[PDB]
Amino acid sequence: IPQNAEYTAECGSCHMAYPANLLPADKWRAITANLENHFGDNASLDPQVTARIEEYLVQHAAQPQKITEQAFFIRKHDEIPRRMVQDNPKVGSFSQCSNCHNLAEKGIFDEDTVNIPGFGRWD
Ligand code: HEC
Numbered sequence: 451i452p453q454n455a456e457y458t459a460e461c462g463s464c465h466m467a468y469p470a471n472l473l474p475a476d477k478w479r480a481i482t483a484n485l486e487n488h489f490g491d492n493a494s495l496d497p498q499v500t501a502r503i504e505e506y507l508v509q510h511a512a513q514p515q516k517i518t519e520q521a522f523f524i525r526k527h528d529e530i531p532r533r534m535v536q537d538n539p540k541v542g543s544f545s546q547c548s549n550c551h552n553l554a555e556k557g558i559f560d561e562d563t564v565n566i567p568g569f570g571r572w573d
């Protein structure tokens with residue numbers, strides 16, 4: 451099975467499994483160091499599973515903060531108005547990327563395939 455199989459199961463449980471290359475290693479370690487305190491939820495795992503997740507993310511990282519707080523993310527999304535996101539009940543926030551980028555879990559974020567629920571294709 452592929453290298454991300456366990457990751458997808460464990461970290462795809464409450465939201466989509468974010469590709470490892472969306473954060474650098476130190477930012478992934480800040481998340482996996484205290485999964486019991488995870489953005490309002492408890493994402494704790496057994497220690498050996500935790501360790502394999504951390505090791506996967508660190509190894510495959512971009513070469514606790516959110517993805518949606520990174521400057522690359524804010525830049526890419528700064529023309530999208532709040533009516534389509536925070537005020538859009540079918541979206542609500544940018545965190546669940548797969549609501550707009552249907553193949554986000556496969557790493558596909560291309561603008562030409564984005565479709566915002568309730569609004570349609572962007573391009
Ligand atoms: C439910 C018990 C969760 C599990 C299992 C995991 N995560 Fe999670 N994560 C959870 C919540 C409630 C949130 C906040 C969403 C909100 O809309 O703000 C998150 C968020 C993240 C993020 C940030 C997303 C963003 O807005 O940029 C990341 C990077 C993240 N979670 C990673 C992650 C990993 C690596 C997990 C397995 C160890 C994992 N999450 C599991 C809830 C839950």
Ligand code: HEC
Binds near residue numbers: 529544562566
């Ligand atoms: C719908 C409300 C979105 C959510 C949720 C996320 N993204 Fe997005 N993204 C969206 C649009 C409409 C656009 C195009 C913006 C326009 O002004 O061009 C994007 C673009 C990206 C890109 C760049 C894609 C390209 O072709 O260059 C990336 C890398 C990207 N988005 C990533 C991303 C991630 C990681 C998200 C969840 C944390 C995410 N997006 C959410 C709309 C929406």
